[PDB]
Amino acid sequence: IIMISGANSGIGHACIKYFLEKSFHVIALDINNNNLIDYMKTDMPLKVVQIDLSNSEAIHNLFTQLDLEKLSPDILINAAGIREITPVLHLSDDMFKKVIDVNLVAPFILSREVAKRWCESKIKGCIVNIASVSGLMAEPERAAYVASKHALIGLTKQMAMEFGKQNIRVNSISPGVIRTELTALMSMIKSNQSLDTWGLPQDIVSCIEYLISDQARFITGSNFVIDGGWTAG
Amino acid sequence: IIMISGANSGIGHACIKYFLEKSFHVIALDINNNNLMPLKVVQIDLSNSEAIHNLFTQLDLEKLSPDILINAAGIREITPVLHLSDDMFKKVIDVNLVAPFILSREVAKRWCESKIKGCIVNIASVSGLMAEPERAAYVASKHALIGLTKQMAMEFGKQNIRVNSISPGVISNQSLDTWGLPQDIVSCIEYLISDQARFITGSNFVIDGGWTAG
Amino acid sequence: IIMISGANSGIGHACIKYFLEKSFHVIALDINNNNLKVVQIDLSNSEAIHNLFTQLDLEKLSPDILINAAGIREITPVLHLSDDMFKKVIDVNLVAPFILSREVAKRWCESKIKGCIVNIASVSGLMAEPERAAYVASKHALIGLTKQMAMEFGKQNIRVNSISPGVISNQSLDTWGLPQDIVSCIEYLISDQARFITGSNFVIDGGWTAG
Amino acid sequence: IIMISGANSGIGHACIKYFLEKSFHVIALDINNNNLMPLKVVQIDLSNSEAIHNLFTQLDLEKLSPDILINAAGIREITPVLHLSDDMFKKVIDVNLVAPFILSREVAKRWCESKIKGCIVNIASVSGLMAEPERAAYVASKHALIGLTKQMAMEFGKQNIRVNSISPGVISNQSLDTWGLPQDIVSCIEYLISDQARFITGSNFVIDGGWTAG
């Protein structure tokens, strides 16, 4: 059982399809589901929850439903995220906070909750946080985004230490520019990379597969940068 | 004119005495004032953003705007993560990240409108570079702050607004055989705000007795 | 074809085993050989490297993939660490990766062919330790070098990445790392699934660098 | 007494004026001397480690042990990496990394022997934190030097020997509209050797006008 946030789009949605193909049971979290409706009509082992991850009450109601339905996820993938592009002086309090509530607070809460159940059961859990190269190098017009992505890397490290004794591994992936719904400008992207190729969702999906695998037994608290050389210098 | 949050204790408090004694006009922000000349002391809960907005309404009525922001208000939970509630996680984030962001946006706005230089110094921590147990919020919030620092340094650089951070160690795991003291952090602030710091922006100054070395 | 330095021991030897088993033409380089082209070479000798490349230019053998795993760790108080012991660690741990990396990249650029280099660094490339001045300098240098060479050769599809093993209490996890944790990472990093990965350093360390 | 490599040019040079003018006895170390009061000038190739060992034998016989060491001698190749030869890479390493290693071990030996409380500053670079085109040896050497700073800080910390580095940017890819000047490096050196730097070691001070910010 693998629980994936941001399931309606981009990376999270490429994960939904990939992991259903390899016979995982998938719990999909997203605030929209227009791009999951078709799959909901099938008999695939797919539980879709509609949920505003910025509402921490709704996150409890999620865990109430999972407990009552007897779903303990084995893996959590925190991919849901938002990103502002607005001058910092135009960025309102609420919207700074929204970006924080989705990108940082929600991963923390979902992580505390799955980890509570894993601790209680002696299960060997796995968590992957999708941060960003904005968690390492800043960008203009992105105060909250950079802040939130730096915070999530930090959080990954902290929570790896908190739960390592229980063999719950917690890692992050920091994508560079990946072509999804979230994303002249193209030549600027390339001029800031080393590779002349576009980042795709499959590059992140593959990294997740590596990091949830048995081969990743000794991997915790690390940040895997998947960015075509953006952070190189 | 320097604005200092966390003025009622430790690093912020030590900054009060020191810049008053250097002849600065001081605006002191803290939720407590028991521990508190050109000194405006404000009793304020900095996790309440409505109260930061009202502070600025008062400051604009007073035609009083800071040249310098020191974000030293801060809280550290010590709680096992399973016992760290939603609200406490968020409170730590609202004090340690959201309040520096709001205070910084606000003083940046007025520096940009007045076309005046400005300087912000953010008090982070070594917990911004290295995690520790029982510190989910503290660590995430301090990391976030370091990232906030670099971001706003980039945002405002062209307008000559410098934004830097300091990451103190503790004020065995150290390299030096001495205690970190408040004055070690004050001296670095003094440096970061000075004319000698004209070319320093987006930098994190670690003052930690070798704690982060290895 | 894959070239692996440090082939006689630990991480390098584990790779020889795995990549034969996977059908690769392996080229092992090492000073010792007591444990497939096997070359006995001291990599701290720059003219031996140039000769290996001479020989290899005559045999048609230029690797598709390079794995710099040859390394030595002094454990020496820094006051007793001689000039020559310091240069040697630097010559093996840094200079040789660079010479070996420049040489394969030369042939890849000429042939207009993709290449892949994985540099075995260390968590000592990120966090210092006492009594390891050369080692820590050298592994910090190699992380630097990986990023620089990732930039240098990106637009020729030459990918350059590194791995920072922990030890193969100061960790988060209660197990010991194994040469296979590092081999599995090298495998991932040379895969077609790593098309987008360059300049990155992969930490594989049980949480050692976490905090 | 302050020992300064690279004393003939740029940052080492500007340190010569500066610390002479503040009453330090200075030992200038460089391979050239055309741009060079209690001053001892040594013409020395810092890539030749026999000569270094010589200098210190001599200095011991003159009972001159420096109190402070500034490692500023440096070289940057700008050369495409396919044209960077073995010798060229080794030379950059020998100057930028090996020499500061040796000079540092040599002055620490004497501080430990005499029970002095010494101070070392390493002049690294933003290329110690970020790669650039055509700078394989420079980038590797400068990353090496940050790493050595942390390690020797850890080694000699029980002996109150502080080891720190500074990472100059350029002395558009910056956030500030401005050039670094040697003085920005010199003031930072002055701060790191001071009594207010008592709790500072292992640290890396970036002075780059936002280059590394993102």
Ligand SMILES: NC(=O)c1ccc[n+]([C@@H]2O[C@H](COP(=O)([O-])OP(=O)(O)OC[C@H]3O[C@@H](n4cnc5c(N)ncnc54)[C@H](O)[C@@H]3O)[C@@H](O)[C@H]2O)c1
């Ligand atoms: N695409 C990129 O270039 C890129 C690069 C680096 C990092 N990232 C990060 O990767 C992750 C996914 O990015 P993507 O490109 O797939 O984005 P995307 O916008 O295509 O999809 C993100 C999904 O998150 C969901 N989400 C947002 N807010 C939510 C809420 N409050 N409750 C529930 N769901 C919510 C969205 O609705 C969406 O379906 C994010 O964490 C993002 O910051 C993306």
Ligand SMILES: NC(=O)c1ccc[n+]([C@@H]2O[C@H](COP(=O)([O-])OP(=O)(O)OC[C@H]3O[C@@H](n4cnc5c(N)ncnc54)[C@H](O)[C@@H]3O)[C@@H](O)[C@H]2O)c1
């Ligand atoms: N002392 C250390 O070991 C250490 C180390 C690294 C970083 N720090 C950081 O340095 C800064 C100052 O720490 P300190 O040791 O001086 O702490 P302290 O507890 O002595 O002082 C912090 C002050 O912040 C104030 N504060 C907390 N919440 C507030 C709110 N909601 N509104 C207004 N004020 C509030 C407190 O009332 C207190 O006066 C903080 O950012 C802290 O995280 C401290």
Ligand SMILES: NC(=O)c1ccc[n+]([C@@H]2O[C@H](COP(=O)([O-])OP(=O)(O)OC[C@H]3O[C@@H](n4cnc5c(N)ncnc54)[C@H](O)[C@@H]3O)[C@@H](O)[C@H]2O)c1
């Ligand atoms: N095992 C660990 O805990 C660990 C941790 C971090 C990094 N590393 C690094 O991984 C790499 C391999 O590690 P290992 O555990 O396999 O060490 P090892 O001693 O088991 O293997 C090193 C190999 O490198 C070869 N080598 C050393 N000097 C040489 C020279 N001058 N010329 C040619 N070959 C030479 C040795 O002969 C040996 O076969 C090294 O770069 C090392 O620094 C290891």
Ligand SMILES: NC(=O)c1ccc[n+]([C@@H]2O[C@H](COP(=O)([O-])OP(=O)(O)OC[C@H]3O[C@@H](n4cnc5c(N)ncnc54)[C@H](O)[C@@H]3O)[C@@H](O)[C@H]2O)c1
């Ligand atoms: N200027 C910048 O923008 C900048 C940026 C980042 C880092 N740095 C670093 O700052 C330090 C000083 O830089 P600078 O700009 O003053 O450089 P520079 O070239 O102006 O001066 C360096 C000096 O080191 C000396 N030197 C070189 N090789 C020597 C040898 N083998 N023996 C003795 N002396 C030798 C040279 O003769 C020269 O006088 C260096 O370590 C450099 O890498 C400078």
